[PDB]
Paper text:
NsP1 is the membrane anchor for the complex, forming dodecameric pores that associate monotopically with the membrane in the necks of the spherules to gate their entrance. Enzymatically, nsP1 also has a role in addition of cap0 structures to the 5′ end of the positive-sense viral RNAs. NsP1 possesses both N′7 methyltransferase and guanylyltransferase activity and reverses the order of these reactions. Each nsP1 protomer is built around a methyltransferase fold common to SAM-dependent methyltransferases with additional insertions (membrane binding and oligomerisation (MBO) loops 1 and 2) and extensions (ring aperture membrane binding oligomerisation (RAMBO) domain) that contribute to pore formation, oligomerization, and membrane binding.
We finally obtained electron microscopy maps corresponding to the nsP1–m7GMP covalent complex by incubation of the nsP1 protein with the m7GTP and SAH substrates and 27-mer RNA, suggesting that the presence of RNA is able to bypass the metastable state and stimulate the guanylylation reaction. We also obtained a similar structure when substituting the 27-mer by a 15-mer RNA. Here, the position of the guanosine base moves as the ribose and alpha phosphate rotate by 56°, bringing the Pα close enough to H37 for establishing a covalent bond. As a consequence of the phosphate repositioning, residue R41 is now closer to the alpha phosphate and a new H-bond is formed between the ribose and S44 sidechain. In parallel, Y248 is now too far from the alpha phosphate for hydrogen bonding, and sidechains of residues R92 and R275 of the neighboring protomer are no longer visible in the maps. Intriguingly, the SAH substrate remains bound in the SAM binding pocket now extensively contacting by VdW interactions the m7GMP moiety as a consequence of its rotation (from 3 to 14 contacts). There is no density for the pyrophosphate product, suggesting that it leaves with the magnesium ions. The H-bonds of the base with E250, and the ribose with Y285, are maintained despite the rotation of the base. E250, Y285, and R41 appear to be the pivotal residues on which the GMP moiety turns for approaching the catalytic histidine, R41 being next to the Pα transfer reaction site. Transfer of the m7GMP to nsP1 is only observed following incubation with RNA, whether in the form of a capped RNA (in this study and in Zhang et al.) or with uncapped RNA in the presence of m7GTP and SAH (in this study).
Numbering used by the authors:
A (entry chain E), B (entry chain F), C (entry chain G): 3 to 364, 376 to 414, 422 to 450, 460 to 469
The structure:
Amino acid sequence: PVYVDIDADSAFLKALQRAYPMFEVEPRQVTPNDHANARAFSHLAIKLIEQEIDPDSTILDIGSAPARRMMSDRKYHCVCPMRSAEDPERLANYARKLASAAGKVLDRNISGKIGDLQAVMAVPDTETPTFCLHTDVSCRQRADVAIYQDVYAVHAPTSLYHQAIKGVRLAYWVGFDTTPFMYNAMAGAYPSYSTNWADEQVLKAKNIGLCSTDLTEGRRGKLSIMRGKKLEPCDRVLFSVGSTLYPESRKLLKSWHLPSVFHLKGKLSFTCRCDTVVSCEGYVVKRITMSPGLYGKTTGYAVTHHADGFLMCKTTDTVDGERVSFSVCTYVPATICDQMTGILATEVTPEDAQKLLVGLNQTNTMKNYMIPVVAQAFSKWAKECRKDMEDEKLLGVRERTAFKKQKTHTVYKRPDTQSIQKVQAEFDSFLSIPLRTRIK
Amino acid sequence: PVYVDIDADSAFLKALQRAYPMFEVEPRQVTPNDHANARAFSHLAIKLIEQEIDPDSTILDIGSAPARRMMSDRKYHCVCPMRSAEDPERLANYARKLASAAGKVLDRNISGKIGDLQAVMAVPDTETPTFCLHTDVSCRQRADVAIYQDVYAVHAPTSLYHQAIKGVRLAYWVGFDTTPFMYNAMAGAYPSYSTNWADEQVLKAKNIGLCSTDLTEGRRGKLSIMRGKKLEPCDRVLFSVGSTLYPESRKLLKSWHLPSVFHLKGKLSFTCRCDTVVSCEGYVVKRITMSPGLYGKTTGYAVTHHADGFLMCKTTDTVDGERVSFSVCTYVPATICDQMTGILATEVTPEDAQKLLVGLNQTNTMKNYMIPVVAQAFSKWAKECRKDMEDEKLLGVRERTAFKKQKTHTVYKRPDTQSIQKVQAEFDSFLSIPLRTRIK
Amino acid sequence: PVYVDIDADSAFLKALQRAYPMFEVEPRQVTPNDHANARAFSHLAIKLIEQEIDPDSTILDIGSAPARRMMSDRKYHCVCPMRSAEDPERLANYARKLASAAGKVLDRNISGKIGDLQAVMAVPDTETPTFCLHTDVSCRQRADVAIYQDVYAVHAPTSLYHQAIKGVRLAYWVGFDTTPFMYNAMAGAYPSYSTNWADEQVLKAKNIGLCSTDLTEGRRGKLSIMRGKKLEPCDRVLFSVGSTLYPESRKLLKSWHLPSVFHLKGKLSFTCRCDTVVSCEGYVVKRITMSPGLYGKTTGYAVTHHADGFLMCKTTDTVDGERVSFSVCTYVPATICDQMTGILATEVTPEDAQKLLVGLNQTNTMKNYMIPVVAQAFSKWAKECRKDMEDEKLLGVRERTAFKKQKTHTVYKRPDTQSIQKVQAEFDSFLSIPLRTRIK
Ligand SMILES: Nc1ncnc2c1ncn2[C@@H]1O[C@H](CSCC[C@H](N)C(=O)O)[C@@H](O)[C@H]1O
Ligand SMILES: Nc1ncnc2c1ncn2[C@@H]1O[C@H](CSCC[C@H](N)C(=O)O)[C@@H](O)[C@H]1O
Ligand SMILES: Nc1ncnc2c1ncn2[C@@H]1O[C@H](CSCC[C@H](N)C(=O)O)[C@@H](O)[C@H]1O
Ligand SMILES: [Zn+2]
Ligand SMILES: [Zn+2]
Ligand SMILES: [Zn+2]
């Protein structure tokens, strides 16, 4: 019986029961976290990780939070280099949790982490069997399973290779769904988990989940010195999970949309297969299985199965004040898309579409905070499907002179469709002094 | 009592009970697999195979996943050449499951596969009685029954001949229905099992089960250097089942719609009969019975019986941006097609057809993700029948000048019809070092 | 209590109870056969045969499937020449069934067929008392009763004469009803048993139970080199029962519509009477009683009694693309015809007729897959009856100038009418080496 922090009356519990049917979910609250769904899914994924793997295995935990995964009965190796401002707080939490259960729990080898902590505090470059300060590039101890607890700032191919050299059989990756990023979207929804992401340039917008603007009077004279004339996504993107803000890199995050099969040829060439074992409203658990040698041929395509609908809409917003049009992605629950099918056949206006949507939402299924844009996406999809209907062409014959590109303003992946996108598969090229006293 | 992965509340269970009436199906979930129906049907077909065949027989398992079919009480011989990227994972799973039940299950001859695995690891060219690295062309062990567990990249005539030489009495083949591919369609449906296939050229579409497009602005200038001017299917096709992507060859898969009776004349000439013993919403189980000698005369025709309706619709879509009209195939449940019969007699618009279809879907019978296409197919079939009504011709009199070819935009095979197409019947012409250590 | 394969909830069971009232039918499924009704009727007919005939008799079985009729307590003689591609697999099934019950069932004289099988395997030209490799023309052992288990490629007069010379008192024939073939139709229905037939030329149609076409664009230039300008039936016809495709010859199949009484004059002249003892939705059991000598005078006419209505409609279809009009035959249940009698009095359009048909079909009485055609037949029959009404002629006075033939486009035999058709009655003129090892 697994225990979950989410409130008992929350509907997301049911979704969790669908995401983890092999585990019995029991809700109870200890903290009123603004973001409880994400931690609940992470805990369930960790429990499934414990269940699936072989107990007689060494589990690498890259980007680890040592305090969380120390009460586990398995033998973990935490690899937490000091590359973020969050790391010192986690080291403090680990220190308190170690010197709060050292002599009161026996069957957890707590003295092992105690001695390893003393050793690493003494020598910063010592490879302890349960705690390592090195990076994934230069970690040392051989293991067989790797766990990525929501690590988003790392290059997937290089890290996978540098850990496959060490001998991992199979690595799991729990986190957010990468497809909205490989679609080149500006802002995101992840409505159930209350996590919204936005690009740096579109931060000062008005009508997205992640924005903040200021009221102005009738000045058409702000006269910016710098003129770009190209609103394209950039590398830096900011996530807001509950009340905590985290910066990610677009390239590093987008690199996690691994193909179904791929190869890593270097000094030692391995082959790998990646599949989604658990998916729930945006949170995914990928299973990249290591394999020595160079077997088979790779296609170069990545597949995503959308259990619930995906909606990439074209919305105008006042970014920094100026009206600009950009693409925003949204996740729509399966039932809402299911019931909004007959209506999505006519020439429907955004007003009528949004009225029907709120009437459909009754207890809420989807967050009402982001159904001015779902209605817009549905209206534009109806527009496109219609204009496609009475523009029926001829078999096997295009119209090339140079050929006409006609308008696509929204992408509506139905709650049972799958998306293939091309992704590269043939990967070829790959402490502080006061803190030492603070260790005690 | 057979045990099935699919959820208890899923309607597809009933279909399974219709597909396997001799077997009692009991539902329970161990994993939340995105694709559960396909594995369910595969397991049920394997249990049917165990029931039907003679226990005192040697069963060739070509393209085998040895881990799954090793717990069986029969004496299987797995043939798993390293021709796919998944094969290393299959060998790893076999190794773990062998060294996880070696000394705790007795009546399964586990030590046999243990010793045979050591033998093949030692000598890669040794034909062990339960495991081999060879290809179906060059396998050695004599047997009497062959099993094809969803093998899709192989030529049916050559493989059947090369195994019939070895002495198989009868070979079963469980897989997808090959009927849509001899119909020369671009995209596929298989709605119940959530498996959608698409051609190479139509991957970047908008309104099929398997597509992914990007929003673009008003640029009628993409100016492609290469101009084809012929939208015809090619050999490469991509399947997406659940979240896994599998590449298939159009010719190799199309070769599996074998005629009712056919002959294989070579050094030794055999005769064979192929029949569909199990069929459910697309999944089929063919029964090709070997027979030495040359008796009878072949018709050269292959029959598919459609328990549920088949729809070949002509849909426009913006592939890579450019709008073209291509053909998509769809499976419609028998109940929906049955209730939509009298309505399919009028001059019905796609709007009214889609509204009435979504009304008929109430709990869902068919997946609502693909009823803009079914409605269009029904409307066009009504159009064709209506035009066919008042164009009555004379007995035995054609109109040849060179004679008029008037248009069919959809093929609607009713849920009790049979479709025959001409297929060729007179078939005339026919490990790495680190993995070796990884075997332990 | 007869034991039947067809599903318990199916309506056809009721019809079966009407076809065999002397037998108690108990349903259950052992296989999910696509075609279960046909095998059900065949088994019921065989059991009726067992009850009717004298136990102290020798029963010839032409075109035998020895495996099926071996468990019977009576003494059969199977005559199964290698004249079809199905024969080898039937022999293999016979061999397995013989060497699967040789020493565990006693009161069936199994060792008899064992020894006779060894004898024929040794000498291919040996007339064993329970198995024979000769044809019906050149079979040897004298008997008194003959059975035709759905044998379809044989000339009825020649076979009947060559068996009556051997001394058969009476021969039964279980099969499909031959009236639609003597009516010169292109496509057939047999809706209850899900078996559809069609001529070679109309294979590539669109709107029959047996067709397969391909979508095309507006090319009115296919320019066939060969021009026939005549759409008439040919000898070759394709049957599709469930998922099984069988070829028949039109002349041989039409020869089975034997008259009520006929004579065979040769070296020995016999007299025979043919009658239908059991009829159900298309399946018939004829009972041809032999008699030595030349007694009585023959009328030369054959009568078929239609328990359920018969409909020959004139439908236009795109055969290979070209629109041509041909005749299709259909069986309509008695209840539907009875209820649609008042409506069949007015000028009714095909639209209204089909709407009332689907409304009458509610659970389904007749298969909805084929009620575009029944509606057209009913509408055109109503048109013919109407035009027949206000065109009253004078008593016994024709109008001959050469006399006017006016148009019949459908033949509607009511569910209590009988059809008389002229058929000729005065009939005047009439293994491999590896298989031998496979016998073991
Ligand atoms: N290249 C790299 N190799 C190993 N760890 C890295 C890394 N880059 C960043 N990290 C670490 O990964 C952590 C991500 S924060 C995530 C912490 C924890 N997995 C959780 O989900 O709660 C950071 O603390 C950072 O120190
Ligand atoms: N020509 C051939 N002869 C024998 N096996 C082949 C083959 N071509 C491909 N294969 C094997 O067939 C496998 C198909 S993947 C199918 C695995 C398993 N039957 C399942 O359904 O789960 C591949 O792993 C490949 O190694
Ligand atoms: N002229 C002939 N004389 C005797 N048998 C013949 C024949 N022509 C064909 N046959 C046999 O008749 C068989 C018809 S298939 C019918 C099999 C069985 N009676 C059943 O209904 O299931 C063929 O196998 C063929 O071998
Ligand atoms: Zn380390
Ligand atoms: Zn082998
Ligand atoms: Zn004989």
